[PDB]
Amino acid sequence: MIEVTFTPYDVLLFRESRPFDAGSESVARSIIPLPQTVAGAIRTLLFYKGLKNCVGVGEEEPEFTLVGIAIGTRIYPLPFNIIKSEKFYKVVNPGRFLGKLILPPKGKYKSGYVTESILEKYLKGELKEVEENKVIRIEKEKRIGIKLSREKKVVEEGMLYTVEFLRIEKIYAWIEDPGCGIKDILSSYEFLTLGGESRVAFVEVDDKTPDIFNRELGSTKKALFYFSTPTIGKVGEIVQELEKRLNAKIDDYLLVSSRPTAISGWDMHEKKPKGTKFAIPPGSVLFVEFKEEVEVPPYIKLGKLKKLGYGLALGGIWE
RNA sequence: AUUGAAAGUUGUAGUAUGCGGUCCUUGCGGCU
Ligand SMILES: [Mg+2]
């Protein structure tokens, strides 16, 4: 597995799906980067390097597989079963009622990010709570710009716009290369355009598997699956897929989640927006009670568009 | 082949208008 590290020179824009044309709708608000955007940046580099075989021009997916992405300062969205109570974010474990897994009422969820070490303790079921100071928020930087007339140096009519950028220190991407020679091509490049407004990020590439993908969790009936990237597909099909890949049937499951992630994007091949897809948002947790004990995998890919970085679930246990 | 491409928060704008360092005060006492 190859590990790509993107270091933004300054700011990044991963624009939400909304009109953003000069002289009209003029507000661009960034979201947390979707893995397909990172995949697109890599595919575009290969598209220009002449490796159009691995790109998948006009195709939904490339030949290579983007395992997933993570932002860094490496941090992850607070699991949705972690609820803020006073100055602490408390882990809420599944309960049972009428023979069904439920999450007991303990307050509303508040968004935020935690370090990889805090997530690791969570996945091992050893995390009780997190002090509110260790819960990170992503910094935004709002910039307001204009367009000037060529000669008179005054603002052209209606040419004012606003961008809410993200201030991100690092983005990590992991790629499985079936022999396209991506590691060599990425090594030849120092930087690439990532997201909107022609912002660039420095590129480093190392041949390594992150330790979080190599954890030994043991065997249990009570496994959980933390989605680190958006996961596309019906919950039923995802659970069924999970049953097949682990060769074990499920007694019951509970999806703790939030607002669905709206995913469209821009088709650079056809020069028009991509079709809207809906996904289980990062930070969502699928609690599963298998009928038999399973060896909980450190990570597992689920749902549609796996090669674009979607459906990266991190294994964990609960009691 | 990335909700992507493209867009100078710029142009005009005097820290200025009014305002007394003035009022009260014996170079004197006779001492060292
Ligand atoms: Mg632009």
Curated annotation (Swiss-Prot):
One GO location term (cellular component): cytoplasm
One function term, GO molecular function aspect: nucleotide binding
Alphabetized CDD domains for the sequence: Cmr3_III-B (cd09656)
UniProt keyword terms in alphabetical order: Antiviral defense, Cytoplasm, Nucleotide-binding, RNA-binding
A Pfam family it matches: Cas_Cmr3
Keyword Nucleotide-binding among UniProt keywords: yes
Keyword RNA-binding: yes
Chief location bin: cytoplasm
InterPro entries listed in its UniProt record: CRISPR-assoc_protein_Cmr3, CRISPR-Cmr3_IIIB
Subcellular location: Cytoplasm
Effect of E141Q: Still cleaves target RNA when assembled in the Cmr complex
GO BP annotations listed: defense response to virus
NCBIfam families to which the protein is assigned, alphabetical: cas_cmr3 (TIGR01888)
Family of this protein: Belongs to the CRISPR system Cmr3 family.
Subunit architecture: Part of the type III-B Cmr ribonucleoprotein (RNP) complex, an elongated RNP with Cmr2 and Cmr3 as the base, with Cmr4 and Cmr5 forming a helical core along the mature crRNA (39 or 45 nt in length), while the complex is capped by Cmr6 and Cmr1. The 5' end of the crRNA is bound to Cmr2 and Cmr3, while Cmr6 and a Cmr1 subunit (Cmr1-1 or Cmr1-2) cap the 3' end of the crRNA.
Function statement: CRISPR (clustered regularly interspaced short palindromic repeat), is an adaptive immune system that provides protection against mobile genetic elements (viruses, transposable elements and conjugative plasmids). CRISPR clusters contain sequences complementary to antecedent mobile elements and target invading nucleic acids. CRISPR clusters are transcribed and processed into CRISPR RNA (crRNA), formerly called psiRNA (prokaryotic silencing) in this organism.
Name assigned to this protein: CRISPR system Cmr subunit Cmr3
Native organism taxonomy: Archaea, Methanobacteriati, Methanobacteriota, Thermococci, Thermococcales
